[PDB]
């Protein structure tokens, strides 16, 4: 007994991760590979397989099919890593046609009735679907995952905000190329260079972190999220996968790095308690060596490769300020892997039927 | 009429910048190219010319000579970019033999009688040379320049600390390979990877910044330096030259990013006043665009290429925090250029004879 | 008596070399920077200065103007490095307005009345302008330079072909990114990868070499060009400038590599003879070290930087086969520099204004 | 029924492949991880895992042990990828103590009594062992595998030489960084550069190819190997795994690239006929796309990832010349996978008993 998934944009840098991971999944099958430009061609002939291994045997000869909900009677779930602008209306059209829709796209991320989900952090937000359906009058639904960059920060910051009076986080990112898609970043922009991404990208990263944090169930009540200073300075360099982030985190009062570090080691959420198939044992992995994590060596760490955010370099700066770094696999936990985990949580909660 | 310079480690990545720059200098000539390994060989035959243009024609034919005082009777100034551990005692040997020694090495940077010198920040600390001479019973002297990474931070921070109640700066660095020398960083460390340098390197960057800031003559007296919180998280990636740094800067009172930027634009010190030949018209260049500076494009910027720290992205974070970035050409301003500027100051103040 | 020149696609990777070089030129001035997208704006504000130094002081505040042959009264020369498909009809408009056009684009390279010019190899071919003017009934004219990759092989092969019974050349190229222009090659195509350009690219390289070789005045007449076997296998990697090529060259009879070496060393042409300003003293520089030439260190070689093809590794393979490598600066000698050289030749022979 | 393996230099770039591969092998166990500088420590804590996936769970905890025959009583096979100069005497010490040693080092590659083994091309030359043992008066033996670079040309070239009148091959290599080990190639040698490896490396590549070809059993007799002309021009670039080569192959008589293509597509040797576990189904994979193979996308191709040489771009140059490209995974087929395959062969022919 399995569920049949369609993956929109299946030849893309995110769609390849849905293909790789769903090919190994116990009950979600990659059964319908949707596109536009290469409709009618075999997947393995057209795809850039910029990930680990090779195109799965059983997928390689599948023809890419039209992005058309009228052709998808047989499909149980839509995964939608589509580009911004194009995504919004396609996802509405699928939802209106009665599909569950898991989007990795930005278009719906701040709809107050659409869940911006990190399953370990705000699983309770899925019950927004009730109101979504009723107010939007459709049988289906849309759920979004956040910007991968925002997730590499929000996961550690969420674990901390939960239990500590955190009052700011000032972040520097060093992001990989695959985040921008293909053709994406011109090679001349990152050879012997660093490409700042600009105020617009900095501002959207912070916006998304604020939404995720505004939804975390905390054990302390100070400070109020509105009194939290977040800031980001974002860049891309010539790494293929893996977003590397340096966070300076401030607290309203005296807070020991050793305590925070232990909170990070100990972090887990509903996905781990439920033993969901794509839930890592340790959604945050903490490293103790002063030159770790490194992008190359740590982006595929953990019992489920790519699904863990890897943290290190925990250090006291002064009594109210600590330094840490974090690494997220941007197309796995940051996108496809997070979206598959969303789907398992939604099946588990009753929102997608068996 | 000419002053004759020896360049120790002349073939090295800093040594080459001495040669390129002094080749164009109105009164300090590269008269003696010293080494060890390639003593006896033509310079241009052996040097790795990893900088702009080609080996100066009047220099290529010059043979590499021993690093030995008794051989250097005609020499007026020693520039010493020698590796740590080796440098300390060689520098002392030269100073003892009557030479002015301008070192880019770490060994003497914390000696209480030795200038750790950024001409635009603490030009007055050259007066330490007078007590150094009495203390150590020698007619020469040692002056050091700071770690290039420290200069990238300390230059814009020194400008701010001078005029503002700055109580913290929290730094992320993305440093180039030339800084590590040759063979330096293994290729496998930086292809598809980011290399963290570790706690010792972070700590040493901070300690050097503290020494530099403690010597700035400030126009406000608050807060005390002992009350200032610094932190650095340092990395290398595959860029050839140019250290890029993101600085989150806190103040003890409300502070306008607009004012701080004006302060950086208008920044100048003694070298510009005295019109030293290597003094750039703008020791700090401020950029307005939200994707500048960039390493490749801005590392050779300004009227003296590579002598200016290029700053950008000035933004208000909250009322007491600002974000900026800076780029420093690590072997020009960050080492050889700073050294040559040091030498021009020392000549102008009578420390090195005409 | 300064000639004023218009630069089409002035913001581009090749246009920047016209802007750099003509800024230092003794009688050809860059007086009209033509674009489309950025027309009106200052050159310095928009241009991506992906070359040595900085935008020239006196060019930076020049406005980008529209590309239209009715707005250029002040103008004496057109330099056109425009993309294929676009460039063919544009350049015709300019010659059909009176202007002399030196083109770096592919469109007219195979017109039997359009010179396809390497000034050291086939300078006499400029007389095709006479019967080109006649048969097209227009007052101006078009001259084109060859694909950079083809120049990197044909300059040494032409010097060889003129004096030796060469029957074959079998080429592997390893080309830089700048040749694809901007946005050009996506970053994901060349990070930890080699990108083959394909059969169409291999075939167009060979076709151009063949045209050029057919136009070389020889001292031998064996074999005939029609029996010469040429092959290329072309790639790009993550280098910014410099196309590196490995050539296995065969001969119809016993031929010594030391003789061919001397021929390449001694190679001069009409540009040298006339002492044209942009003519290098050594159009082919021959290196003797078995690890040279190297892209990084040799692409800017020579008295006129980037104007010389640098050759090395001359080795006997068997009695009738030799191996050599060559490095060409693809935007300088391979485009803008060759073009400026074409402009100087044509003035000399009285085809251009004054 | 298992054979216990000792992996010398286990933490090296070739060691980690022995560990990775053997960890999944049906009958060879990686039982003893030998080293020097990290003896006493757990493998997982010190190893640089610069390959696919992560350190196998059951290997991670294993302690690195001394390289000492006296400690290895229970070991059945020694795999030795030790650096040149060290390897020779150590491998002789192991064979004189009674062990079968399969070496990836160059030291013994040209001993008359030491097989230089590509299992698909010259499996019979294992019989050399008998006179090795007689002559050397030792109960163990040494077998070597060739230079990875030589295997990338020798595998397709042997398959051609076996069936066609091949009289020359003229090769250009574009090799990865991992072949030079760690720290190996300094990062500054390869950023925005190509590093030629020189005459000694070119000559040794060809010498190894000649030896291997002289031991291939042919179906045709012309020409004699002594009259075949080989040349190599070798380079390194900033790729991690995978050596890419372009080969121009010539023949003494007319030979159609379509036929040579069919021969390569159909290539198989004794390891396939013996169904050895590590024998890929297709020791040569032939691709049809004019932009394939590519390093990143194909170095891990095949039913056994990295065990197949991938060939592409088969094209007629003239009646007597073709062009093809080949890609080898240099640490799998080119080193550890090739060694394991030799060991299986030696087990199958009774030289190593289970």
UniProtKB/Swiss-Prot annotation, chains A, B, C, D:
One of its GO terms (molecular function) is protein dimerization activity. The keyword NADP applies. Its cofactor is Mg(2+); Mn(2+). Its EC number is 1.2.1.75. Optimum temperature is 85 degrees Celsius. Pfam families: Semialdhyde_dh (PF01118), Semialdhyde_dhC (PF02774). This is Malonyl-CoA reductase. The gene is mcr.
């Amino acid at each position: 007994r399995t569920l049949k998934a369609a993956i929109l944009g299946a030849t893309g840098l995110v769609g390849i991760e849905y293909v790789r991971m769903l090919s190994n999944h116990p009950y979600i099958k990659p059964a319908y590979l949707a596109g536009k430009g290469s409709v009618g061609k075999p997947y393995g002939e057209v795809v850039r397989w910029q990930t680990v291994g090779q195109v799965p045997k059983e997928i390689a000869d599948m023809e890419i099919k039209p992005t058309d909900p009228k052709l998808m009677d047989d499909v149980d779930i839509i995964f939608s890593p589509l580009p911004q602008g194009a995504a919004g209306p396609v996802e509405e059209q699928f939802a209106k046609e009665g599909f569950p829709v898991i989007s990795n796209s930005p278009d719906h991320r701040f709809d107050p009735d659409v869940p911006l989900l990190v399953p370990e952090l705000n699983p309770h937000t899925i019950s927004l679907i009730d109101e979504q359906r009723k107010r939007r009058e459709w049988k289906g639904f849309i759920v979004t995952t956040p910007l991968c960059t925002a997730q590499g920060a929000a996961i550690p910051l969420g674990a901390i905000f939960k239990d500590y009076k955190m009052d700011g986080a000032f972040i520097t990112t060093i992001q990989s190329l695959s985040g921008a898609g293909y053709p994406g970043i011109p090679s001349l922009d990152v050879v012997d260079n660093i490409l700042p991404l600009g105020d617009g990208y900095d501002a959207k990263t912070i916006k998304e972190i604020f939404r995720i944090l505004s939804e975390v169930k905390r054990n302390v009540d100070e400070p109020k999220l509105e009194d939290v200073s977040l800031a980001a300075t974002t860049h891309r360099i010539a790494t293929i996968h893996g977003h590397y982030e340096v966070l300076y985190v401030s607290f309203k009062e005296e807070t020991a790095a050793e305590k925070v570090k232990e909170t990070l080691e100990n972090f887990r959420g509903e996905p781990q308690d439920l033993k969901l198939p794509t839930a890592p044992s340790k959604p945050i992995i903490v490293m103790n060596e002063d030159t770790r994590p490194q992008v190359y060596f740590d982006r595929w760490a953990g019992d489920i490769p790519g699904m863990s955010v890897v943290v290190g370099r925990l250090k006291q700066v002064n009594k109210r300020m600590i330094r840490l770094v974090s690494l997220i696999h941007n197309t796995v936990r940051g996108a496809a892997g997070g979206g598959i985990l969303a789907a398992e949580l939604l099946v588990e909660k009753g929102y997608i039927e068996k």
